[PDB]
Design a protein around this ligand. Structure first.
Ligand code: HEM
Ligand code: HEM
Ligand code: HEM
Ligand code: HEM
Lengths: 146, 141, 141, 146
């Protein structure tokens, strides 16, 4: 996206410290708990009835890890987000029929989880850069939509 | 306003915020101004640099209003009536901006209270902030 | 729920809709399905072709619920409680879809009642539909 | 945008009948009445305190006409919306700081006004095409945003 060289370096440096399993599981779990309508798309994962069930569900953790890995590809390809997510945009629009507003919700949840894991190191300036990244990913995933 | 379980969660979480409400309010504003530059246009008369005395003072007012809200969960419209007029009728704040500040407040709470900011508490706080936002934009409604 | 002036406008406009509520409900659904294809996924068991008997029947139910709402403006949560459970707890309808249906309903009213659909009435109806939507998604809140 | 040849012809045929002055004045006026926070951006137009004042204000009509004329350029250049609105995107983001959510609101208001003027001729199918157009314009105006 539109990031300065100094910003890009800071974004990449934080990603070196991101455990995609831990962060991914947490982010997807929080999405499902905080915005419960999103549970509709994940009925095959089984019991998602209470926070405890969600956060400890192995399919939630595994899928969360895949989501974060995909975010990671975006972070390392900031100049071609549209190309990086083209196939995934197709999947989310044509096959899953996910409303794009939910991409922004997940992106924001991700930012809250990064804040929780990194504390004071996740400065207002670094958060601002990450907001640009998640908006960019959200926009790239919405590309093939109507 | 909220469900009984949410009110319990909100009062409990805010007790852990305690005397830091003003500091968190100031930090949340800083995060909003940097992360979402369109919001700066509502504060032309402010020095929006980091450590700005006006931002600190304003964050205290924001934090105090949230503390007031937590004490009046069963009557938010009554307790925040004056602020609803200010934000919707006088300032004409675009409703989308309440969502941005709410996100920045949750981000700030996660930074400082990582062990207390559990999924259940996160969910209740989101509902709380949405309810407050609804009241502050109710003159558009 | 709304302001006194809005309630007046809403009751008046709905009187002009009168016995056409069901027809308008059906047309609004058709406009939503064609204009916003993501919404079709909630109705797999329906034949969504034009003139579908199921869409007509369902539009009648939608129109009747709106008519019920207009008669209980001071207690929407009470009057629509059953529907709130259905939409949020059972069906898990994404809140964005209420905005889409609301827009399609306003579009439908504009087509059929162009002289009655004034700016003031438009504004009051938007507030009414938003209030109904808030109630139907209140279990997410 | 992504329209079939039959859809494009129908969209263009309706535009032949659009009075940009009447429709534009009405659309902007309704935006200001229905979503009152938008009045903040138009304080230089004077009294916008009640529907009557808004709908009859000459600056609202004149500006509405300009907005619709710009929409018209989009309709006749559906294959290059991003290029057509590049300058306007810059203006709305860098100078005016309009949140992009409001572009969608105005687009939807426009659709309601078309419905009111054309009645039964504004079929569900034609509305569906116009929803694609207004989304496309909204997205093109949001391009230069952060
Ligand atoms: C940051 C935004 C998102 C990214 C990067 C992302 C990424 C992915 C990836 C990598 C997959 C696996 C692709 C495959 O099946 O081969 C996937 C599948 C899926 N996504 Fe997303 N996703 C995002 C947001 C969402 C949201 C918001 C929802 C719905 C609320 C959603 C619903 C699904 C579902 C239901 C699947 C299929 C899961 C299954 O295998 O059963 N995604 N996504
Ligand atoms: C949780 C939501 C919010 C709460 C509780 C809140 C609270 C307050 C309070 C208590 C005041 C009064 C300050 C005083 O008396 O000096 C105030 C003023 C103000 N608020 Fe908010 N606010 C919220 C969200 C927002 C948002 C989203 C914006 C716009 C982005 C905003 C913009 C303003 C402005 C411009 C003033 C006037 C400041 C001045 O001129 O000194 N507020 N707010
Ligand atoms: C003004 C807002 C709405 C109102 C007043 C409304 C009203 C109703 C009513 C009265 C029923 C019961 C039908 C019956 O008992 O047979 C119903 C069911 C249903 N609604 Fe809604 N609805 C609204 C919006 C929506 C939206 C936005 C969606 C999703 C896009 C939706 C999806 C459904 C579905 C899938 C059913 C079950 C239909 C069936 O299985 O036969 N509704 N709604
Ligand atoms: C369909 C979306 C829109 C289009 C196509 C559009 C188009 C235009 C055009 C052609 C101009 C004149 C450019 C000039 O000054 O040379 C303009 C200016 C302006 N626009 Fe928009 N606009 C849109 C939406 C909005 C919205 C949603 C707002 C705010 C709520 C807004 C606020 C303004 C303002 C304040 C001006 C300057 C008016 C002045 O001269 O004082 N626009 N726009």
């Amino acid at each position: 996206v539109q990031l300065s060289g100094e910003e890009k370096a800071a974004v990449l440096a934080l990603w070196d410290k991101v455990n995609e399993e831990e962060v991914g599981g947490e982010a997807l779990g929080r999405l499902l708990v905080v915005y419960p309508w999103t549970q509709r798309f994940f009925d095959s994962f089984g019991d998602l009835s209470n926070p405890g069930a969600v956060m400890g569900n192995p399919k939630v953790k595994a899928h969360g890890k895949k989501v974060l890995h995909s975010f990671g590809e975006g972070v390392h390809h900031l100049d071609n987000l549209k190309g990086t997510f083209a196939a995934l945009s197709e999947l989310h629009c044509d096959k899953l029929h996910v409303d794009p507003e939910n991409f922004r919700l997940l992106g924001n949840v991700l930012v809250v989880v990064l804040a929780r894991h990194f504390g004071k190191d996740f400065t207002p300036e670094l958060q601002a850069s990450y907001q640009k990244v998640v908006a960019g990913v959200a926009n790239a995933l919405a590309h093939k939509y109507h | 306003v909220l469900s009984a379980a949410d009110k319990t969660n909100v009062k409990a979480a805010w007790s852990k915020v305690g005397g830091h409400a003003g500091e968190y309010g100031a930090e949340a504003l800083e995060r909003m101004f940097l992360g979402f530059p369109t919001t700066k246009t509502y504060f032309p008369h402010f020095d929006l640099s980091h450590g700005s005395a006006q931002v600190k003072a304003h964050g205290k007012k924001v934090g105090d209003a949230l503390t007031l809200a937590v004490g009046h969960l069963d009557d938010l419209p009554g307790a925040l009536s004056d602020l609803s007029n200010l934000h919707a009728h006088k300032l004409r704040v675009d409703p989308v901006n309440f969502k941005l500040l709410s996100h920045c407040l949750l981000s700030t709470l996660a930074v400082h209270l990582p062990n207390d900011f559990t999924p259940a508490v996160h969910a209740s706080l989101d509902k709380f902030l949405s309810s407050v936002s609804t009241v502050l934009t109710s003159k558009y409604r």
